[model samples]
Target: DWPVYHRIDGPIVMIGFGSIGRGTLPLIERHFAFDRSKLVVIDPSDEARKLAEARGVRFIQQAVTRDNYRELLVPLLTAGPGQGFCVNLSVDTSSLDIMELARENGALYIDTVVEPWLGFYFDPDLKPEARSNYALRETVLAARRNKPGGTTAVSCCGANPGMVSWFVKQALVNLAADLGVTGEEPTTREEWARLAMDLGVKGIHIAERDTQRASFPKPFDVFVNTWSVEGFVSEGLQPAELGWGTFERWMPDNARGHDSGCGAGIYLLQPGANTRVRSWTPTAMAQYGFLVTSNESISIADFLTVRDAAGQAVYRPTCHYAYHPCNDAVLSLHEMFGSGKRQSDWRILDETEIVDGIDELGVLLYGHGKNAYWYGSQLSIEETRRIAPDQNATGLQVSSAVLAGMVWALENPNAGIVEADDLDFRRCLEVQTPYLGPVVGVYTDWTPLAGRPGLFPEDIDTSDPWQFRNVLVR
Candidate 1:
């Protein structure tokens, strides 16, 4: 009897049946009690349909688009007092549109990412800056402000964007305690910002190093990844985005800013896959990671930013993701860039093939009194299977967060249009921790300047160890 699971009276609609969606189904069935007949999954892949049908869950081999989404969803989400929930795990479908539609239909909604209509990521017409994650995030934030209250719609509720926010909060509390700052944990956004500022947190990195590998060598011209290949490619193709910090002395030469909304971040005029940054994780002591764009980078910074009565940002630490995906994924990216086209064949590495490795995902809280602290999950593929069915460490981290988000949404149905930072960390972590193998905190003396190849002369900032200029490995 897990405390997280709750019986459902209404139908649950899951969009997309790819890696994340497929891994999520078994967990949904195991935890929540719902009518198997009422559980409907909409996906376009025949492979997905086979998996869903095998599980005895109804699978519809149809895609949801802007034109027919409402017509298709309206029937499933019948109007009634009964609670309805939509778990969006698809690509191509607009997340904002689905969230709005779900809320209007009196159904709570949640998504792992803020995906737009197909071609938005690879649109040759749009400027690199315009197609950045920061732009998409601003659009979602604007929507949240416009529509103040309705059925709960949790955005970016997967692993990195979802569980990592909780990790940041937990790390801050731990750091505060270590530095002799004793009191009740800060509840307000302003207080959290102040706490971070007081502790001298100049930068936060959503650092991750995934080492899961298959027994066989990767095939030629194929994109192989631990999670969704499409999802990874889409985000990797976007311009790198990061939260602008007060402590940052130098900005990227190609950086651009938005014309409106909260000025929390700036976008580099380069694709994230090509951009690399110095970062660290537990097992992978020190490593270089792609400067990938994510909602968590902007949301975490915006959520913890403190402003004066005049609305001037007083304290905001620079934040961004530094991810070194599975080795095969790195090679796939290299191949994609070299060929200058999407791979025709895509493969998601099965758990059976992943004999060894762990996804070391956590927040690197640096520039604090303790210099640096990495706090979060270190879930392995085997450990992931022990905790849940049909998931790798990467997939389990996401699905578990989805589970937590759903639990929170059901309990607080009226708390509308929330992000990971808006949820109760204790409750979310309580539900998610069991799945995350060994949740631990480790302090490091390592900085971006710690180990340099010293092959060429470079401009390094020696005055401040936490400076962004030092973090950027040239």
Candidate 2:
């Protein structure tokens, strides 16, 4: 039997009605004791409205924009001493603005990414630095300075940005136990950082391989994927970013740095979909993955940074995404890049329609004493349909993470703004692991420089195999 995490006494607003939103509603209904009448779903799609109508819930058939969000949501949330929850599962929305509104109204909030207003990413005049996830994440990070300890607002709580962070911590603990090291678990960020430094973790790859595919061939004019097409496309177009670790020495000619904020990461001039990195997952042992910019990449690096007396990061591990999206999605990107335009039509692969493959999502922590350890979720399409409804393997990974994050926020209502990187990993995993099929750790001997000797003519870092110079494709 599933365990009910908590009780909600106020209005719970569902800000989007896409695939994740559809999957999340069922989880919330099953795991929380909340009034069904108080729940409201906001989306622009007529299908979304019809779906909500069939499910017998309040549906606001409109997009939540910067112009209408405050006025539209103020009535749905508790104005003071916030008692409700704001589950933001939309694209092209301002998370900072919405989350700020939720806090002011005394409501708890959670979202999968640091989303900006509609035109933010598409503006040609904006510099690549302005459109990077580092900019988006740091903007959210700066919110901590304005006020501390308000109603909880958890940011970036989806699969990679959300659950991968928890995996990083799990990998740390697992690595420590296997090395015959004995001590109490880390109590603070620096303690965790020191543990990683002592164990010799050079870097991390938020490695994910989504193999779930449909039986039908992808139409040339239509983009097909397992998750949000808009969300993925927007991110893939942004400048590639990664956490610059202390172990890294060689920087790419085009990589750029920010002069302000946490100073945990750097960015390259090209879009993420155009950049690639060498990484490993349990199933996909050795593969090339897109260096997709994500919130967890920099946040995890900053959290695990071991600073000296002078406040300089002495032992920060390099972290970035190495994502090999579903086969169809990869083909879509190829076509999109080749044609110099996005597809006019978009389709999210249904779990029922997906006749094969699995989503092997996890974190690969390398350069440790045991070489490398990957901890994460490996859920197949059949198992995904059985575990939860209205979701594919990819949807379950993200929706379940959103569920865990909401549960965490409810349990710690006044904890203010936080990321999955800042929450209790054990607590989050307890609630999330059930939906995440087989959550396991696999240790491997693979490295970026494992097979590249006389085969290539490019510069390779022979001194350290785990260096980003060797990991990144030239």
Candidate 3:
């Protein structure tokens, strides 16, 4: 008997066959007891069809677009009694549309990122701010709000957006325990936000340092990454974004806000790939990382934000991603920027080519009395291979979350559209922990002001150590 097996009755339809979709297949097969014939994968690429066919999973060589998604997915999703599950891992399809359609048909759904139709990312007519993650996130949030209750649909359940959101809650619990606060875990959103406020947390950083490096030197004209090159490039070209905190004293000159809604974050006119911030992880301490826009930065902040009876903003933490991607990826970004156009040639770093490294991803919580704390997974490539096939540390983190999210959706079929923050962290982590190399929590005295040079005159906020002024690296 498989230890993690969950007998899913309905057909499982995967929307893409890229790195994440391919990695997820093995995990789903290993953990779930389901009909092999019922498992279907849809992708235009035939690259992984042979491997998929070897495992008895059917592959349909097609792409899902806004026009054909319903026609393509409806037949597959509504074939069973409770509507089959749709694990959307495609790049160009609209996540909100698929999610709504799945729920309408009484099916369970999950996707790593909130995506729109093909040309939305690079639409010339849309303003730079309109193409931002913040805008996309708000649209999804609105969808969730509009549809109160239905079949479960998990959004943004990948590593940074998915796992890191869960890490924030765990870090809070750990901090609470360390501070000797005794009570049942906060059940409501208000309670969690209040807890963060009381703990004196001014901000949170989804800090990640990917040290994986290929043995061969990167070619000059090609874009290389451990994951999806297109996905990275799409987000890299967007505006630098972060969840605005009330404790922040200064805002960027180019910062802009939404006219309405949660107001969880704001966007800078500059692209995310050009932005940098100070952050720390367990292995790579005091590292500078790009302020890449992500869904978690806004959602996590919104989840932990507290409001008064009048709905006035009360407490919210400054949130953003501080990511130092693999060295080759950094170089690729530089090349792309210098060329003023995306590289036509692209390559994903294979596991065999990786000499030695770890994807150290975690959340950094700061401004509490003890200074700071970091909690999350540090999964190495070798460890990833031992636990699952066809994945590295980065892929494992996301695929494991996909596995866990599927399990949760199967267990609670009518839970409605949910983010990673809304699900039970303990339950999700229980299913995901084994695949994660080492889930750890550590306290650090490190801060943004740790290594600042006093010799140079700078806009340093001396009174408060956790200010956004200190976190933003000039």
Candidate 4:
């Protein structure tokens, strides 16, 4: 018997039936109460249709295009004004447009990432800033009135961008206790920001290592991953991003600043997958993780930024992604780069076929009193099967967060444009932790420059160990 979190009184319309969508559907059905017949899945692929239909949800084999998304979605959401939900798990559709559309129709909307139309993502003519996630997020931020009592749109509510935000807060609380900093819990954004500042948290790495594997050897000329291949490949091709903290003594030569919005993040000149950074986890120490530009990278730092009386950012911790996706996906990325072409045979690793491995995904809050604290899900493949159907550890982490987001959105329907940072971590984690396997908090005495030698001269700043100087592999 699954724990029913909320009664979804409205029509639930899920856009796209990708791996995330596939895994999330079962969890939604298990936890939320709603009319089964009122649910629908809209995806373009015949294969997607097969899965959706098999699951007994209404399947519409049509793409939600920019031109037709409104019309396609409007008729189905006839339940009207806070009585419908739009679950966006698609890649090419604009999250900004769709979220606003859902808002206008008074439907709660949720998406894992700030997605763009295919044209914006692939267009080489656009400026680098125009192509950045910052731009996409800024546009989404601009649409919001942020007033209470409006239909909510939960933006970027997946694993890293979603659950990781909650992990950061919990890690902070744990750190504070370990270091003997006691007071009431941080209730306001400024208080959280100041707590981070006072705690000596110099930076954060959204560290993730997905080692799930199948017994079969990966075929040549094929892209295989644990989740959405398109989602990974597309984001990997975007410019590297990081939330710039005030403790930094150095900046990348290619890094550029944004002119508007929160001013908490910076963008690099190169693709995120091609960029690598030094980060650590409990299981894997001193591993190289791709500097994948993710929403949480910016959102976490922005959320914890402590500003001065003059509106200057006095204290902020550097935040960014250090992702090592499933090994086959790594190989596929190498193949794509070498061929200078996207592989036609893209595949997601079958959940049942993942014979071994765990997704050791966590937030490494570095340069703290105890060096680094990693707090998050350490879900194994073996346990995933026992926990949920049609999902691996990685899928369960995401879908579970989506489940939390949906529950939170239903609970707080009037909260407009909610980010993971804006979410109630304790409540959301309460809803999510059961599915997260061992939601642990681990402290490590590891730094990027832990074992560096004097054999070769380096530009790293030894004054502060967690400086971007030491953290980044130049």
Candidate 5:
């Protein structure tokens, strides 16, 4: 059965006035049939005052922490049905605190990343593994036990954690069809689960290919990302993590970590910056990057698993990112790593004022005909700036996912703490497609071993280029 889709109508509250907040505001206004004056933005930044004033949206200068979040949102949440939609697009605030408030208030909520307090990312006391995407995600997932159903809070729904999951779903359905498997559109969770089990899918990669051009050279203290600098840095400093798929082969003795509770993934001993993984994408050849991210690793492995009552996975694929960030950020990471230091250069890129290159982001799934498939948002920076006056290509990718997430929340009002992988791909794609340029699907015969000769004794699954395990770093 096809799920019914409904547009949202409400009085919305946005927390944060950064690039993503600003980019998303217009989209929210365009989609939801709500009174303009009722929209409230919670931010202490004077930078947003001009936009807030010109747009006639209410701006509250209250910076919230875990202790005071409820106090700030209680009135708004108790205002009644259709009174609140908490779009958390802020930095410094705790995501769990904000999410708990939203749940208590019964308001719909969404955020690009599951951010903690302002300095949580920089806190040296916490172990690197504890700060990982895998650990953070598990903490949030565990929270669902307390609040079974209430507010619809979408976690990690930005371009990577957000649309990337949907891309994997779409890729799988297409792969299944190409394999000559036919079935009705999966209507129930059980049915979808069964379909995934039957596919022999080892894993999914929220593979992305971003090539953003910056106008001015990145001056000292300026950190640039395709999306949020704060968001990117937060995850960058966390432990290098990935969903670990069981392999018939043995791991290198140097590899260290515990298998996750889900028993589908694992943490690595080294920082993401020091670790490198292999992956492929269309239009781009097989690439390698520091196993620097947590989302693709966990989400991809989880997406392709078939589990039993004991939480032992019947089948799961290893997954991790092989990123090649924009030239400037690449240089920035190198410089930071060379100095043996990490800094909180919390500067956000101005979308309207960007000077150069397109950010080409997409996902590549391997193991099919032609060997691999890459499908995703390929919006150039210049084209994105032209399309939306206030957004760059990177901002558009992140903000577009926020828009798609709101649409999902509106349609599935009762759904509980949901990850990107659990949502409906068709509806999400429909909402996200317009913002993403040329959502093309392609096939490529690329592999990480393509150009490299066997110079070292490396353990790699060369049998298939797209295998999840092949993408894992020891």
Candidate 6:
């Protein structure tokens, strides 16, 4: 669902000048007309301040905390309407607080993850479940209940949480048609909800396949991503969680804890990928990753279900992400798992240095004849470099999502709290498609169990790899 695109005619408040923030800012500046005098950039890092200064962006050298957020945001709030947008590309900040501030200031807001203040992601005092996606999502959703008006705020609208949501919706419609159901073509939220209710969608995976790379080996303890390193680690540490639907016949021993009456989140008893769960996408093979992320699991499951007369779900997917990051990052993850040390120095492969390979970023929705369907940004490193000298394929995938989210927000200025799933898929894709390279939709017959040896004693949904029980984290 594509939300309306709001015009950026004034100043924009940008928090965080890290890779994601910087990359996103240029795109916004290039595409939308905004006031340079009104532009505000916030970051505590001296490096970031310098970068902003060089770029002619207004800089604020202050640490934004839960306690001082109001003070930090007050100046921007006073700027009045058309003060443009709040691009929250920072680490160690409260997403809820930022969105709230943007709403109060009458400015549109968008962020990739629901990031918390500094040290929140790695707070040893907090229980593993406390740092889970379900908890994070619940926190935001709870906030939405109290103040539900004003400027549009797009949540989890980056590559996985953002663009992936739209991919799932489009993939579902195509699959439904291929299956000859001729299901309703839903243009609004209510209609989409009803269609999901009718289709028997148990869960969804914001599944991705990444193969981009450079010549140098990834250093130990150093995490790599196409966008923000802080953002990646923040979600990585959270307990692997997915939505547990009503159809699940059994649960994994590691799965634990649900928030009060809210059943949208489910936590893995252990870390994800290490504990492999079976699931399918449309064109890719049935596969398993370390159940590595939270957004794909929760949002996809929640979006597809139908709550009924007795307050019960008619259909819901047990969804979780199965990701294969860059080869170096994969090795780095293995080393981190083996060494028990988190490498603080983070690095993202640059487009200039990446001599070969493509970041095959796409979603594989499995189960049908060809088994899985893969749909998404297929921009290669080479092509990405050609399109934008500073960006690589993966960066473009994420940055493009950020751009599309802002565009949708501008058009839907008063739509309130929103997620990528709530926006228009076709419109968002139109804006993102060019940067995405070959946006192909392919069907493959693949599965996690495909490579497994025979005679493994375990319960599995033999009939379908796309089954909710197979996909959702135990």
TM agreement with the true structure for every prediction: 0.97, 0.98, 0.97, 0.97, 0.89, 0.90
* Per-residue accuracy of model 6 over 243-313 as CA lDDT, tens digit each: 76665666667778674635766787566535455544333245445577656568767776667799676
- Which residue window of length 10 is worst by lDDT in model 3? 1-10
* TM-score, cand. 3: 0.97
lDDT preference between candidates 2 and 6, better one: 2
lDDT of 6 at 239: 69
lDDT of 2 at 96: 98
- Candidate 5: worst 10 consecutive residues by lDDT? 1-10
Q: Which regions of candidate 4 deviate over 4 angstroms?
A: 80-82, 146-149
Which one wins by lDDT: 4 or 5?
4
- The lDDT for every candidate, in the order shown, is 0.87, 0.91, 0.87, 0.88, 0.70, 0.70
Please report how far candidate 1 places residue 81 from its true position, in Å: 6.4
Superposition error at 329 for model 1 (Å): 0.9
Tens-digit per-residue lDDT, 200-232, candidate 3: 889999989999989899998899998989888
Candidate 6 at 80: error in angstroms?
A: 4.2
User: Which regions of candidate 1 are displaced past 4 Å?
Assistant: 79-81
Off by over 4 Å in 5: 1-10, 188-197, 248-260, 309-311, 343-346, 352-356, 368-370, 454-474
What does candidate 4's lDDT look like per residue over 229-257, in tens digits? 88888888889999999888889899998
How does model 6 score by TM-score? 0.90
Clash pairs detected, candidate 4: none
- Name every residue pair that clashes in candidate 1: none
Tell how far residue 459 is off in model 1, in angstroms.
1.5
Candidate 3 Cα outliers beyond 4 Å, as residue runs: none
Candidate with the greatest lDDT versus the true structure: 2
The lDDT ranking, best first, is 2, 4, 1, 3, 6, 5
Model 4's lDDT to the true fold? Answer: 0.88
